[PDB]
Design a protein around this motif. Structure first.
Motif, PDB file in Angstrom:
ATOM      1  N   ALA A 157      58.671  53.349  27.875  1.00  0.00           N
ATOM      2  CA  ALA A 157      57.630  52.767  27.052  1.00  0.00           C
ATOM      3  C   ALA A 157      58.195  52.146  25.798  1.00  0.00           C
ATOM      4  O   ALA A 157      57.436  51.723  24.924  1.00  0.00           O
ATOM      5  CB  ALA A 157      56.595  53.824  26.695  1.00  0.00           C
TER       6      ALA A 157
ATOM      7  N   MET B 235      58.069  56.239  33.251  1.00  0.00           N
ATOM      8  CA  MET B 235      57.988  54.893  32.731  1.00  0.00           C
ATOM      9  C   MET B 235      58.636  54.858  31.365  1.00  0.00           C
ATOM     10  O   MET B 235      58.344  55.693  30.504  1.00  0.00           O
ATOM     11  CB  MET B 235      56.548  54.417  32.638  1.00  0.00           C
TER      12      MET B 235
ATOM     13  N   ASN C 186      62.030  57.252  15.204  1.00  0.00           N
ATOM     14  CA  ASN C 186      61.007  58.156  14.711  1.00  0.00           C
ATOM     15  C   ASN C 186      61.170  59.565  15.246  1.00  0.00           C
ATOM     16  O   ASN C 186      60.366  60.439  14.909  1.00  0.00           O
ATOM     17  CB  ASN C 186      59.614  57.628  15.055  1.00  0.00           C
TER      18      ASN C 186
ATOM     19  N   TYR D 169      60.350  57.718  23.729  1.00  0.00           N
ATOM     20  CA  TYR D 169      59.323  56.849  24.284  1.00  0.00           C
ATOM     21  C   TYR D 169      59.427  56.806  25.795  1.00  0.00           C
ATOM     22  O   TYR D 169      59.718  55.759  26.377  1.00  0.00           O
ATOM     23  CB  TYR D 169      59.450  55.444  23.716  1.00  0.00           C
TER      24      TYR D 169
ATOM     25  N   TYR E 296      60.884  60.484  18.390  1.00  0.00           N
ATOM     26  CA  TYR E 296      60.167  60.656  19.638  1.00  0.00           C
ATOM     27  C   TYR E 296      60.860  59.895  20.755  1.00  0.00           C
ATOM     28  O   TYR E 296      61.442  58.830  20.544  1.00  0.00           O
ATOM     29  CB  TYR E 296      58.726  60.177  19.509  1.00  0.00           C
TER      30      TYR E 296
ATOM     31  N   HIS F 131      63.909  57.029  20.019  1.00  0.00           N
ATOM     32  CA  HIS F 131      63.593  56.093  18.958  1.00  0.00           C
ATOM     33  C   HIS F 131      63.942  56.693  17.603  1.00  0.00           C
ATOM     34  O   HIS F 131      64.198  57.890  17.465  1.00  0.00           O
ATOM     35  CB  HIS F 131      62.124  55.706  18.995  1.00  0.00           C
TER      36      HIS F 131
ATOM     37  N   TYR G  99      53.248  61.782  27.493  1.00  0.00           N
ATOM     38  CA  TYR G  99      53.687  60.623  26.742  1.00  0.00           C
ATOM     39  C   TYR G  99      54.506  61.104  25.563  1.00  0.00           C
ATOM     40  O   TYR G  99      54.331  62.222  25.080  1.00  0.00           O
ATOM     41  CB  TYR G  99      52.512  59.772  26.277  1.00  0.00           C
ATOM     42  N   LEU G 100      55.403  60.241  25.113  1.00  0.00           N
ATOM     43  CA  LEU G 100      56.300  60.553  24.008  1.00  0.00           C
ATOM     44  C   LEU G 100      57.104  61.814  24.296  1.00  0.00           C
ATOM     45  O   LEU G 100      57.140  62.755  23.507  1.00  0.00           O
ATOM     46  CB  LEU G 100      55.536  60.669  22.696  1.00  0.00           C
TER      47      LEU G 100
ATOM     48  N   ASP H 264      57.205  58.102  29.265  1.00  0.00           N
ATOM     49  CA  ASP H 264      55.956  58.642  29.749  1.00  0.00           C
ATOM     50  C   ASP H 264      56.138  59.100  31.177  1.00  0.00           C
ATOM     51  O   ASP H 264      56.958  58.554  31.913  1.00  0.00           O
ATOM     52  CB  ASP H 264      54.843  57.619  29.667  1.00  0.00           C
TER      53      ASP H 264
END
Lengths: 285, 112, 133, 285, 133, 112
Positions: F96, F94, F33, F37, F35, F31, F54-55, F39
């Motif tokens: 996200a 997954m 940002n 995404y 990070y 992304h 996560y992330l 998980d």
């Protein structure tokens, strides 16, 4: 300009106890008016009753116990005069329930439990004196921790919609904050409910969050129309969730549809506009 | 400045019977806020003065309801509804409106 | 509110002294104080006064220019130094705290309220200053 | 516009414990930098460390105790990830002292005392787990009540200028708030001191009052120069009592004359202007 | 965070059902939720999702138009009603709470942070829906 | 939409030896940002799925430091530093980033 804190309600605090806000709700149909003393800051910042400006004073009592009576002082240590309101500033405002207060001292150890019954004749916080109920001698600062079903009249269950009898019998002017009513037009009062610790699902209602009180007190909005139409915006998305109206005595009202208990708590009350008090609200939803 | 005369110099009373101590100021102690900036202090024999009444009629911390403040403008009355034995002493009417804060000569409230 | 005063002693006429009033049990920094004196057998007489910040000091006309009132907010102390004493100043000196009123809203609200009001709620027990030869 | 709460300091609260502010002071000469985690809100409202927006979260821990370890959660009940800061939001920030926490539960009675030593190896609030130290099983919400001299190293006395070892050893990024230094120039940091209950004259320092944090967080001042020159105005009279400067990381500094411990607490910090960081201050007085 | 799900039962192909997820221990009003399903012997498959206010509901393409997700913020409940079921929907259904991040500053700060992030931190134990004749 | 392939279908490892589970996304999970995404969930045999990572690399509540997230863009690696007996099960990557949230077929991490 009049402004309400741009913080989520989940992140603010109740005004009658130092607790996080858990829901937005309405009053049971048996309760028309409420007469809370804490959490009473008009929209122009005039604190009335026993409402302090910071949460470091909410639901706190400070005083010197003689072993038989706690001579209440203000929380700054200075003596209390009945002149201000019904009790020292920040005095607990929970009616229909027994208070339980955690008491500490500057310079000493050993916090102590103080159980308070608000019905008896010796509970006259207007004369600056409550019952000690076993609290040893000395100067104490205590904060409300949890509540309980009242001791009198036995058999009654918790009704947090009342206020304690502050003494101050027939002759004197009690300085009690005036009752707040549903303004009519099918509107019902809206209460910020915080979970109180206690032997049951205690949802303590307050008319405004404490940070709202501090913002209104520090801001001192010069201009107040008849009412302040608010929307409860969801910050992640930006969709209005339902319109409320703030009356100048410092409460919010709304017409449910069957709601305000269906609204999330992560929203933000943005002051929308100044409206008349006859202004018709859309039902919650 | 402000001179606070009092009457009487001594007030002999019986326990229980309501007593009236008058204090008259050379200037009007009515402020614009509607309050009479006059305080009533009780110096008991051998103690430091303690504030009984302030702002005309308001009672301080621990003052029983038998102490009442009446009057206005320039003349004020300390009314003791039921004089007890704890109330003996010198009652001063202090002007609180402006410095230098001038006290009155005091009335020595004595009980019969 | 406890206010403890000390320093009173026999002073030669024209000497000096320093009376201190140490406070405990309340926020000393936010309280106005005043020194009052009672001559032996006479009525109360107000001597001087000081605000919380200590920049505003008021004096009686009989002691203006000879007494100095100051305060140490750190050590919670109030001070009255006396220079060029006279036999007229033989008296018991009390430190009294002026009445306070809780915040209750701000300056738009409090400038119509009687909050200055001069009244002395708490008093110390006084220290005796005898000025003699 | 950037604004600080127009309330007296006597009426505000400390940011590291739910207590009224009692003094304004400076640090002992042995302490150059402090690294508080609570009370850390930049002048643009970016809360860093474990600082919450309301006092209803300051110095509070919520979690589920297994009898041996308190698995910390956030105060809203949701699980805690080391991702945010060094510990759950609102975690106590008192170093060099033993915490004592009053613990309650929603739905039950009987508040309970929880004594916390912050030195041992099992105090790893970054991994979401502190030691139970006898607290029975269950979900608890506790608030800091009073402090004590530390248990290790024995013989050391209370130094509230430190922060607890939040665990999070060598490898991980600790998310600790950066240290704040005296901006050099004959300038020393200014700390809002609140009286903590405890066996001694405990003056807990915080960099900003909590209401300041909430005002900066809700306001989110877009524009920050290099520093914000403040004056400490006395509200009754209107005379400036001495100039301070707020640096963007969220602290105030001043040059004493021998201060700021000599200033009253009933004043109000009015944001005067935006100044450079080299701007020379007049000594306190 | 405890999420308890109920309502799963054998449904005639084309019938209806209603799965509820009652939450306890956290502010339900401020948490996004999602329904995911696991077919017997297959991998996890995400079914639907709902925001806190309940006005934003997202559906998988296999169940779009037949499943309806809603929420009662008062009674702390999440709801998934199923109409016109097929044998393909035979699965265990979990209600999962999406990750949350503490407030930490506001929307000027949080729109550059990864707070949406989709991740499901807490899960319920699922209720089994067998669609058969 | 996004299809998340994983490798391998089964990863046989000895307790203690570091294991690498790869997951590749059809779209880039980076992304703006910074990070990723993505998980990593662990469904153990007979339990509800639990969020491990996560992330990209961040660990959830109670995840020991042996679980690490590496990789970026489209290919990510779950690295278990010291495989224990508690880590056996199906690991799903997954996505996200967007709905419908698509899980991968999962790798059945089994121990030797």
């Amino acid at each position: 300009p009049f402004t309400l804190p741009n913080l989520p309600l989940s992140s603010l605090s109740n005004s009658r106890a130092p607790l996080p806000i858990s829901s937005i709700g309405i009053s049971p149909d048996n309760v028309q008016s409420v007469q809370f003393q804490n959490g009473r800051c008009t929209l122009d910042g005039r604190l009335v009753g026993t409402t302090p400006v910071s949460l470091s004073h909410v639901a706190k009592i400070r005083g010197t116990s003689n072993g038989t009576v706690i001579n209440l002082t203000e929380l700054d240590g200075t003596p209390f005069h009945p002149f201000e309101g019904p009790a020292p500033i920040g005095f607990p405002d929970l009616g229909g329930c027994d208070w339980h207060i955690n008491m500490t001292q500057f310079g000493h150890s050993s916090q102590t439990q103080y159980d308070v019954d608000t019905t008896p004749d010796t509970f006259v916080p207007h004369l600056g004196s409550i019952q000690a109920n076993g609290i040893g001698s000395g100067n104490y600062v205590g904060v409300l921790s949890w509540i309980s079903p009242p001791s009198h009249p036995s058999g009654s269950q918790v009704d947090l919609w009342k206020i304690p009898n502050y003494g101050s019998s027939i002759t004197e002017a009690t300085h009690l904050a005036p009752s707040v009513y549903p303004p009519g037009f099918g509107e019902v009062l809206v209460f910020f409910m915080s979970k109180m610790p206690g032997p049951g699902a205690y949802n303590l209602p307050c008319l405004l969050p404490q940070e709202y009180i501090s913002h209104l007190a520090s801001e001192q909005a010069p201009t107040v129309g008849e009412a302040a139409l608010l929307h409860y915006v969801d910050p992640d998305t930006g969709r209005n969730l339902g319109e409320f109206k703030a009356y100048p005595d410092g409460f919010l009202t709304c017409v449910p549809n069957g709601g305000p208990q269906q609204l999330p708590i992560n929203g933000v009350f943005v002051f929308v506009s100044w409206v008349s008090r006859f202004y018709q609200l859309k039902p919650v939803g | 400045d402000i001179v606070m005369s009092q009457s009487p110099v001594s007030l002999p009373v019986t326990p229980g019977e309501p007593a009236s101590i008058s204090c008259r100021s050379s200037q009007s102690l009515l402020h614009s806020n509607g309050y009479n900036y006059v305080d009533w202090y009780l110096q008991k024999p051998g103690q430091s003065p303690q504030l009984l009444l302030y702002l005309g009629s308001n009672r301080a911390a621990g003052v029983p309801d038998r102490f009442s403040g009446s009057g206005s403008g320039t003349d004020f009355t300390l009314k003791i509804s039921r004089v007890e034995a704890e109330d003996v002493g010198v009652y001063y009417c202090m002007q609180a409106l402006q410095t230098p804060y001038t006290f009155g000569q005091g009335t020595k409230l004595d009980i019969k | 509110v406890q206010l403890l005063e000390s320093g009173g002693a026999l002073v030669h006429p024209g000497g000096s002294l320093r009376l201190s009033c140490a406070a405990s049990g309340f926020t000393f920094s936010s309280s106005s104080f005043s020194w009052v004196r009672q001559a032996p057998g006479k009525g109360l007489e107000w001597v001087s006064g000081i605000n919380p910040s200590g920049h505003d000091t008021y004096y009686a006309d009989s002691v203006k220019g000879r007494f100095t009132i100051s305060r140490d907010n750190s050590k919670d102390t109030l001070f009255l130094e006396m220079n060029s004493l006279r036999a007229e100043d033989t008296a018991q000196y009390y430190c009294a705290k002026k009445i306070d009123f809780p915040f209750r809203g701000g300056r738009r609200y409090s400038d119509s309220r009687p909050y200055n009001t001069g009244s002395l709620d708490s008093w110390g027990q006084g220290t005796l200053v005898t000025v003699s030869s």
